[PDB]
Short mmCIF file of C-alpha atoms and ligand atoms in Angstrom, two decimals:
data_model
loop_
_atom_site.label_atom_id
_atom_site.label_comp_id
_atom_site.label_asym_id
_atom_site.label_seq_id
_atom_site.Cartn_x
_atom_site.Cartn_y
_atom_site.Cartn_z
CA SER A 1 -9.59 -6.06 16.35
CA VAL A 2 -8.89 -3.10 13.93
CA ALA A 3 -5.07 -3.07 14.87
CA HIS A 4 -4.76 -6.90 14.53
CA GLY A 5 -6.02 -6.77 10.93
CA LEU A 6 -3.91 -3.68 10.11
CA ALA A 7 -0.69 -5.23 11.43
CA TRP A 8 -1.27 -8.56 9.61
CA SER A 9 -2.14 -6.65 6.40
CA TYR A 10 0.89 -4.29 6.53
CA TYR A 11 3.02 -7.41 7.00
CA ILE A 12 1.38 -9.64 4.30
CA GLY A 13 0.67 -6.85 1.75
CA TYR A 14 3.86 -4.87 2.09
CA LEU A 15 6.72 -6.05 4.40
CA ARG A 16 6.52 -9.71 3.21
CA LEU A 17 6.90 -8.47 -0.44
CA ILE A 18 9.73 -5.86 -0.02
CA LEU A 19 11.94 -7.33 2.79
CA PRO A 20 13.30 -10.47 0.85
CA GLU A 21 14.58 -8.12 -1.94
CA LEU A 22 15.72 -5.16 0.27
CA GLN A 23 19.25 -6.43 1.17
CA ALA A 24 20.11 -7.05 -2.57
CA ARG A 25 18.88 -3.48 -3.40
CA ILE A 26 20.90 -2.07 -0.41
CA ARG A 27 24.05 -4.07 -1.48
CA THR A 28 23.68 -2.80 -5.08
CA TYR A 29 23.45 0.88 -3.91
CA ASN A 30 26.44 0.57 -1.44
CA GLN A 31 28.55 -1.23 -4.09
CA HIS A 32 27.61 1.42 -6.70
CA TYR A 33 28.90 4.26 -4.47
CA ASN A 34 31.59 2.16 -2.59
CA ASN A 35 29.85 3.07 0.67
CA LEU A 36 31.78 1.92 3.68
CA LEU A 37 31.45 2.46 7.44
CA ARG A 38 29.06 5.38 8.40
CA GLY A 39 28.17 6.16 4.79
CA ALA A 40 27.13 2.53 4.21
CA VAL A 41 23.29 2.20 4.17
CA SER A 42 22.21 -0.14 7.05
CA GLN A 43 21.04 -3.65 5.90
CA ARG A 44 17.65 -3.15 7.72
CA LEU A 45 14.45 -1.25 6.92
CA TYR A 46 13.78 1.23 9.76
CA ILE A 47 10.06 1.61 10.51
CA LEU A 48 8.87 4.58 12.52
CA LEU A 49 5.99 3.77 14.91
CA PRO A 50 4.77 7.03 16.57
CA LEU A 51 2.27 5.98 19.34
CA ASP A 52 0.46 9.38 18.86
CA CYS A 53 -0.34 8.30 15.19
CA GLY A 54 1.14 11.60 13.86
CA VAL A 55 2.47 10.60 10.43
CA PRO A 56 3.99 13.51 8.40
CA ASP A 57 5.07 12.90 4.78
CA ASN A 58 8.45 14.72 5.17
CA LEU A 59 10.81 13.24 7.82
CA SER A 60 12.84 16.49 7.90
CA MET A 61 9.78 17.92 9.82
CA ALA A 62 9.66 15.52 12.85
CA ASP A 63 13.47 16.03 13.36
CA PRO A 64 15.91 18.28 11.38
CA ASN A 65 18.86 15.83 11.87
CA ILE A 66 17.05 13.38 9.50
CA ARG A 67 18.04 14.42 5.95
CA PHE A 68 17.10 12.79 2.62
CA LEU A 69 20.11 11.37 0.76
CA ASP A 70 18.84 9.24 -2.15
CA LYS A 71 16.09 6.93 -3.29
CA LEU A 72 16.89 3.23 -3.02
CA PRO A 73 16.64 1.80 -6.64
CA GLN A 74 12.92 0.88 -7.08
CA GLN A 75 11.68 -2.66 -6.77
CA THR A 76 8.86 -3.64 -9.22
CA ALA A 77 6.53 -6.66 -9.10
CA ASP A 78 3.24 -7.63 -10.72
CA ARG A 79 0.77 -7.12 -7.93
CA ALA A 80 -3.05 -7.75 -7.92
CA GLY A 81 -3.44 -6.61 -11.55
CA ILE A 82 -0.93 -3.74 -11.29
CA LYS A 83 1.86 -4.60 -13.79
CA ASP A 84 5.28 -3.56 -12.40
CA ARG A 85 3.78 -2.18 -9.16
CA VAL A 86 6.57 0.12 -7.87
CA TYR A 87 8.06 -0.11 -4.35
CA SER A 88 9.92 3.11 -3.76
CA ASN A 89 12.03 3.56 -0.55
CA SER A 90 14.05 6.53 0.70
CA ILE A 91 17.63 6.56 2.19
CA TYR A 92 18.30 9.10 5.00
CA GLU A 93 21.43 10.44 6.69
CA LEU A 94 21.30 10.90 10.44
CA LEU A 95 23.09 14.00 11.63
CA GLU A 96 24.88 14.54 14.93
CA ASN A 97 26.50 17.98 15.56
CA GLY A 98 26.19 18.76 11.81
CA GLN A 99 28.05 15.63 10.53
CA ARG A 100 26.70 12.31 9.09
CA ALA A 101 26.59 9.75 11.93
CA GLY A 102 24.53 7.06 10.13
CA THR A 103 22.72 6.05 6.93
CA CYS A 104 19.48 4.03 6.63
CA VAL A 105 16.24 3.41 4.71
CA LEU A 106 13.50 5.07 6.84
CA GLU A 107 9.68 5.37 6.66
CA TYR A 108 6.55 5.49 8.84
CA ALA A 109 4.13 2.53 9.09
CA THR A 110 1.27 4.12 7.11
CA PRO A 111 -1.49 2.09 9.02
CA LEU A 112 -0.77 4.40 12.04
CA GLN A 113 -1.90 7.37 9.82
CA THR A 114 -5.12 5.45 8.93
CA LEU A 115 -5.87 4.91 12.65
CA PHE A 116 -5.59 8.66 13.35
CA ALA A 117 -7.71 9.54 10.25
CA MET A 118 -10.30 6.86 11.25
CA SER A 119 -10.78 8.63 14.60
CA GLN A 120 -11.61 11.87 12.69
CA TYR A 121 -14.34 10.28 10.45
CA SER A 122 -17.83 10.13 12.09
CA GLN A 123 -18.77 7.07 9.88
CA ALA A 124 -15.80 5.10 11.22
CA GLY A 125 -17.37 4.91 14.76
CA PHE A 126 -13.82 5.10 16.11
CA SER A 127 -12.83 7.32 19.10
CA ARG A 128 -9.52 9.04 20.08
CA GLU A 129 -9.35 6.50 22.96
CA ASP A 130 -9.72 3.69 20.35
CA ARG A 131 -6.89 5.29 18.25
CA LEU A 132 -4.28 5.24 21.16
CA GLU A 133 -5.32 1.70 22.24
CA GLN A 134 -5.23 0.35 18.63
CA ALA A 135 -1.91 2.20 17.95
CA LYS A 136 -0.17 0.28 20.88
CA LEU A 137 -1.84 -3.02 19.72
CA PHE A 138 -0.71 -2.43 16.05
CA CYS A 139 2.98 -2.04 17.24
CA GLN A 140 2.85 -5.04 19.61
CA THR A 141 1.22 -7.21 16.89
CA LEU A 142 3.73 -6.13 14.22
CA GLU A 143 6.54 -6.93 16.73
CA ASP A 144 4.95 -10.40 17.40
CA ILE A 145 4.68 -11.13 13.63
CA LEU A 146 8.24 -9.97 12.70
CA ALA A 147 9.73 -11.98 15.62
CA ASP A 148 8.66 -15.25 13.82
CA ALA A 149 8.64 -13.95 10.19
CA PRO A 150 11.02 -15.85 7.78
CA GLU A 151 11.15 -13.03 5.13
CA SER A 152 12.01 -10.43 7.80
CA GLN A 153 14.73 -11.61 10.12
CA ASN A 154 17.92 -9.40 10.17
CA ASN A 155 16.49 -6.80 7.67
CA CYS A 156 13.81 -4.87 9.63
CA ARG A 157 13.82 -2.64 12.76
CA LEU A 158 10.74 -1.20 14.55
CA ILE A 159 11.13 2.23 16.18
CA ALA A 160 8.13 2.86 18.45
CA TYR A 161 8.16 6.23 20.23
CA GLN A 162 6.03 8.51 22.37
CA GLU A 163 6.60 12.30 22.26
CA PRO A 164 6.81 13.65 25.88
CA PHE A 165 13.86 12.73 23.55
CA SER A 166 15.38 12.88 19.99
CA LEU A 167 14.13 10.78 17.00
CA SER A 168 17.48 11.05 15.11
CA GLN A 169 19.39 9.98 18.30
CA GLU A 170 16.89 7.09 18.78
CA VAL A 171 17.48 5.85 15.14
CA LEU A 172 21.26 6.33 15.76
CA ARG A 173 20.95 4.31 19.04
CA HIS A 174 19.66 1.36 16.96
CA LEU A 175 22.24 2.04 14.15
CA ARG A 176 25.24 2.00 16.60
CA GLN A 177 24.27 -1.54 17.89
CA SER B 1 -13.64 -5.73 13.32
CA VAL B 2 -10.68 -6.83 11.05
CA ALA B 3 -12.67 -5.94 7.78
CA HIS B 4 -13.81 -2.53 9.18
CA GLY B 5 -10.19 -1.47 9.78
CA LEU B 6 -9.03 -2.89 6.42
CA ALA B 7 -11.73 -1.08 4.44
CA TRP B 8 -11.12 2.27 6.21
CA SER B 9 -7.34 1.84 5.71
CA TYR B 10 -7.56 0.91 1.99
CA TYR B 11 -9.72 4.01 1.56
CA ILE B 12 -7.61 6.47 3.67
CA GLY B 13 -4.17 5.08 2.72
CA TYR B 14 -4.74 4.42 -0.95
CA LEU B 15 -8.09 5.36 -2.66
CA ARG B 16 -8.26 8.83 -0.99
CA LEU B 17 -4.71 9.58 -2.36
CA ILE B 18 -5.04 8.25 -5.97
CA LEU B 19 -8.72 8.97 -6.90
CA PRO B 20 -8.53 12.90 -6.95
CA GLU B 21 -5.63 12.67 -9.49
CA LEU B 22 -6.89 9.65 -11.55
CA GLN B 23 -9.22 11.53 -13.98
CA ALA B 24 -6.40 14.02 -14.94
CA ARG B 25 -4.02 11.03 -15.57
CA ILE B 26 -6.80 9.24 -17.60
CA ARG B 27 -7.52 12.47 -19.63
CA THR B 28 -3.77 12.91 -20.33
CA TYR B 29 -3.45 9.29 -21.63
CA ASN B 30 -6.66 9.48 -23.82
CA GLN B 31 -5.60 12.89 -25.21
CA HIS B 32 -2.07 11.56 -25.90
CA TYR B 33 -3.44 8.67 -28.04
CA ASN B 34 -6.67 10.50 -29.23
CA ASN B 35 -8.70 7.68 -27.68
CA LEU B 36 -12.36 7.95 -28.49
CA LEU B 37 -15.39 5.70 -27.95
CA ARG B 38 -14.48 2.03 -27.02
CA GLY B 39 -10.73 2.70 -27.05
CA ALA B 40 -11.18 5.57 -24.58
CA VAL B 41 -10.08 4.51 -21.04
CA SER B 42 -13.12 4.76 -18.66
CA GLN B 43 -12.97 7.75 -16.20
CA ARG B 44 -13.37 5.33 -13.19
CA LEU B 45 -11.01 3.00 -11.32
CA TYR B 46 -12.44 -0.54 -11.47
CA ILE B 47 -11.82 -2.50 -8.25
CA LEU B 48 -12.18 -6.26 -8.28
CA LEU B 49 -13.70 -7.68 -5.06
CA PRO B 50 -13.64 -11.53 -5.23
CA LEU B 51 -15.69 -12.80 -2.20
CA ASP B 52 -13.52 -16.01 -2.18
CA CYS B 53 -10.41 -13.76 -1.47
CA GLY B 54 -8.53 -15.35 -4.43
CA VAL B 55 -6.26 -12.52 -5.59
CA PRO B 56 -3.90 -13.46 -8.51
CA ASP B 57 -1.25 -10.95 -9.65
CA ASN B 58 -1.99 -11.44 -13.42
CA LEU B 59 -5.58 -10.58 -14.49
CA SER B 60 -5.14 -12.57 -17.74
CA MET B 61 -5.39 -15.69 -15.43
CA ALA B 62 -8.87 -15.11 -13.85
CA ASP B 63 -10.32 -14.43 -17.38
CA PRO B 64 -8.52 -14.53 -20.81
CA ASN B 65 -10.74 -11.70 -22.25
CA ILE B 66 -8.94 -9.25 -19.86
CA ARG B 67 -5.74 -8.17 -21.66
CA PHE B 68 -3.08 -5.66 -20.52
CA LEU B 69 -2.86 -2.60 -22.78
CA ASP B 70 -0.64 0.01 -21.08
CA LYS B 71 0.40 1.45 -17.76
CA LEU B 72 -1.39 4.64 -16.78
CA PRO B 73 1.38 7.36 -16.38
CA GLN B 74 2.59 7.00 -12.74
CA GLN B 75 1.45 9.33 -10.00
CA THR B 76 4.14 10.25 -7.39
CA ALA B 77 3.69 11.86 -3.96
CA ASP B 78 5.79 12.22 -0.82
CA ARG B 79 4.27 9.68 1.50
CA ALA B 80 5.22 8.85 5.15
CA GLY B 81 8.95 9.41 4.52
CA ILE B 82 8.96 7.82 1.05
CA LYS B 83 10.00 10.63 -1.36
CA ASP B 84 8.09 10.36 -4.67
CA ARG B 85 6.17 7.24 -3.54
CA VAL B 86 4.98 5.75 -6.88
CA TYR B 87 1.32 4.89 -7.64
CA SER B 88 1.36 2.62 -10.65
CA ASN B 89 -1.96 1.55 -12.30
CA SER B 90 -2.65 -0.73 -15.26
CA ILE B 91 -5.05 -0.17 -18.25
CA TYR B 92 -6.85 -3.28 -19.62
CA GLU B 93 -8.83 -4.04 -22.77
CA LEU B 94 -11.95 -6.14 -22.38
CA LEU B 95 -12.46 -8.60 -25.20
CA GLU B 96 -15.74 -9.90 -26.60
CA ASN B 97 -15.59 -12.44 -29.49
CA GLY B 98 -11.90 -11.50 -30.05
CA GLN B 99 -12.44 -7.70 -30.46
CA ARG B 100 -11.92 -4.80 -27.96
CA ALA B 101 -15.30 -4.01 -26.35
CA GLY B 102 -14.03 -1.72 -23.55
CA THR B 103 -10.99 -0.08 -21.91
CA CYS B 104 -10.44 0.56 -18.18
CA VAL B 105 -7.96 0.81 -15.28
CA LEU B 106 -8.42 -2.49 -13.33
CA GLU B 107 -6.98 -3.99 -10.11
CA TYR B 108 -7.90 -6.17 -7.12
CA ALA B 109 -8.42 -4.70 -3.61
CA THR B 110 -5.23 -6.13 -2.05
CA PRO B 111 -6.78 -6.29 1.54
CA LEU B 112 -8.86 -9.29 0.26
CA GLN B 113 -5.51 -11.13 -0.36
CA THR B 114 -4.40 -10.28 3.24
CA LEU B 115 -7.65 -11.78 4.62
CA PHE B 116 -7.03 -15.07 2.77
CA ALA B 117 -3.34 -15.15 3.85
CA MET B 118 -4.37 -14.30 7.48
CA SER B 119 -6.56 -17.43 7.54
CA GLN B 120 -3.47 -19.53 6.57
CA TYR B 121 -1.21 -18.18 9.41
CA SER B 122 -1.64 -20.02 12.77
CA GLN B 123 -0.47 -16.84 14.70
CA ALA B 124 -3.27 -14.78 13.13
CA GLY B 125 -5.98 -16.77 15.06
CA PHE B 126 -8.20 -16.29 12.01
CA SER B 127 -10.36 -19.10 10.52
CA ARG B 128 -11.64 -19.79 6.95
CA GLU B 129 -15.14 -18.93 8.31
CA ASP B 130 -13.70 -15.58 9.56
CA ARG B 131 -12.15 -14.96 6.07
CA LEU B 132 -15.55 -15.30 4.16
CA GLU B 133 -17.43 -13.25 6.81
CA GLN B 134 -14.74 -10.49 6.87
CA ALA B 135 -14.51 -10.54 3.02
CA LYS B 136 -18.31 -9.66 2.72
CA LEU B 137 -17.94 -7.02 5.53
CA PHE B 138 -14.83 -5.46 3.79
CA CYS B 139 -16.87 -5.01 0.51
CA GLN B 140 -19.98 -3.67 2.28
CA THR B 141 -17.85 -1.23 4.34
CA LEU B 142 -15.88 -0.04 1.29
CA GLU B 143 -19.24 0.48 -0.51
CA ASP B 144 -20.57 2.47 2.54
CA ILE B 145 -17.40 4.67 2.63
CA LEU B 146 -17.27 5.38 -1.17
CA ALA B 147 -21.02 6.25 -1.20
CA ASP B 148 -20.25 9.37 0.98
CA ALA B 149 -16.57 9.93 -0.06
CA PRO B 150 -15.85 13.40 -1.62
CA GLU B 151 -12.55 12.32 -3.35
CA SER B 152 -14.26 9.29 -4.92
CA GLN B 153 -17.56 10.17 -6.50
CA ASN B 154 -17.81 9.46 -10.31
CA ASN B 155 -14.25 7.95 -10.53
CA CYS B 156 -14.48 4.53 -8.78
CA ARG B 157 -16.46 1.30 -9.39
CA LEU B 158 -16.59 -1.77 -7.08
CA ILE B 159 -16.94 -5.18 -8.75
CA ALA B 160 -17.81 -7.77 -6.09
CA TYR B 161 -18.21 -11.33 -7.40
CA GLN B 162 -18.64 -14.92 -6.27
CA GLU B 163 -17.39 -17.77 -8.49
CA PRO B 164 -20.18 -20.44 -8.81
CA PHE B 165 -20.61 -16.15 -14.93
CA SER B 166 -17.87 -14.14 -16.80
CA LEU B 167 -15.59 -11.52 -15.13
CA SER B 168 -14.85 -9.71 -18.46
CA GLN B 169 -18.63 -9.59 -19.26
CA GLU B 170 -19.30 -8.31 -15.70
CA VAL B 171 -16.70 -5.45 -16.12
CA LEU B 172 -18.25 -4.80 -19.60
CA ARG B 173 -21.77 -4.72 -18.00
CA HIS B 174 -20.56 -1.81 -15.80
CA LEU B 175 -18.64 -0.21 -18.75
CA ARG B 176 -21.74 -0.22 -21.07
CA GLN B 177 -23.82 1.77 -18.45
C1 QBJ C 1 -2.32 1.84 5.12
O1 QBJ C 1 -3.14 0.74 4.74
C2 QBJ C 1 -3.15 0.38 3.43
C3 QBJ C 1 -2.37 0.99 2.47
C4 QBJ C 1 -2.39 0.53 1.17
S1 QBJ C 1 -1.49 1.18 -0.17
C5 QBJ C 1 -2.13 -0.09 -1.18
C6 QBJ C 1 -1.67 0.00 -2.56
O2 QBJ C 1 -0.78 0.78 -2.89
C7 QBJ C 1 -2.39 -0.85 -3.56
C8 QBJ C 1 -1.51 -1.91 -4.18
C9 QBJ C 1 -0.73 -2.71 -3.16
O3 QBJ C 1 -1.38 -3.26 -2.24
O4 QBJ C 1 0.51 -2.76 -3.29
C10 QBJ C 1 -3.04 -0.88 -0.60
C11 QBJ C 1 -3.19 -0.57 0.80
C12 QBJ C 1 -3.98 -1.16 1.78
C13 QBJ C 1 -3.99 -0.70 3.09
C14 QBJ C 1 -5.01 -1.26 4.06
C15 QBJ C 1 -4.54 -2.06 5.29
C16 QBJ C 1 -3.07 -1.98 5.58
O5 QBJ C 1 -2.48 -3.08 4.88
C17 QBJ C 1 -1.60 -2.79 3.89
C18 QBJ C 1 -0.60 -1.85 4.02
C19 QBJ C 1 0.20 -1.51 2.94
C20 QBJ C 1 1.15 -0.45 2.81
C21 QBJ C 1 1.61 -0.33 1.58
C22 QBJ C 1 2.66 0.54 1.02
O6 QBJ C 1 2.94 0.56 -0.18
C23 QBJ C 1 3.43 1.36 2.01
C24 QBJ C 1 3.47 2.83 1.66
C25 QBJ C 1 2.10 3.48 1.67
O7 QBJ C 1 1.22 2.98 2.40
O8 QBJ C 1 1.93 4.47 0.91
S2 QBJ C 1 1.06 -1.60 0.48
C26 QBJ C 1 0.01 -2.19 1.72
C27 QBJ C 1 -0.97 -3.16 1.58
C28 QBJ C 1 -1.79 -3.45 2.65
O9 QBJ C 1 -2.80 -4.36 2.63
C29 QBJ C 1 -3.12 -4.98 1.39
#
């Protein structure tokens, strides 16, 4: 299926390449700013999986309690002819009653955006019904892959959600565990 | 199918975002070094499509007449929560009898690498026969998309090839047109 390929590709072509080097980048940033307790960036990459496929580019739009703090120092790697291909990742603070309750690297799984866009292109032969079905399958497949993945054990968290409570509280729910 | 999704995703999630800004980046680099004639970087992104799905990270390995010249100045854009997500691209010189015959931005379509890797993972339920079939379908679909794509008219060239003459000569064949 479309989702099956997208999930395997997002894993092989992205997660597999950034997750083994993420914890060393996170440890470097926390040790540079002596970040302890709530101000210490979580050791895991938090991946937003909206089932509606609505992927905005600014996280401070889906929820105001998600605020950009810093960029995680870039990772570079020679990739498919691109010398020093850059892997940029953003660190966010999660607010609760105005104060910083948690700190983590956060981003959306960009294949969910593709699925929505695909449903808008006549040439794609892909319906809105296909988009919701493939969205659920993409999440389930990514979950199945990461469950067995050696690169991505204790350094990745999937956050699947359906808008009917709070995204910030949901990230914080995972962060507090 | 797996290829159909991969081609639409590579287009929507990558080509659609870098191709409208590529020619301005190319024009900036050529004007910075007063590059004219053979030393002038081609206005198109050259995408390598090996039908065997063999995607190495160093182009100077598939053919020695492909030599790294410079990095095209990075493009940055806020993308799915990643602030200033970096789009790095590499400029290559194409050699003929030791001398520079052409200059172009060159890279492999990374979804072809995913397809090969997918065929190696037992959980993917994807055979070597599926990999070759999906590889051909990925190329054909990408060609179909780019043919009608408004972002990607005169600024993208697909180079599909099957190893049985010369990759460098093949890129040069397109460059000389
Ligand atoms: C959303 O879908 C894509 C997005 C990108 S972005 C990308 C490149 O930047 C080219 C170089 C590279 O692969 O690193 C290739 C792809 C390919 C696809 C197509 C299928 C999805 O599989 C991938 C996801 C994927 C996401 C990538 C990211 O960098 C995450 C951030 C973002 O998408 O902007 S790399 C990447 C590679 C994938 O397959 C090779």
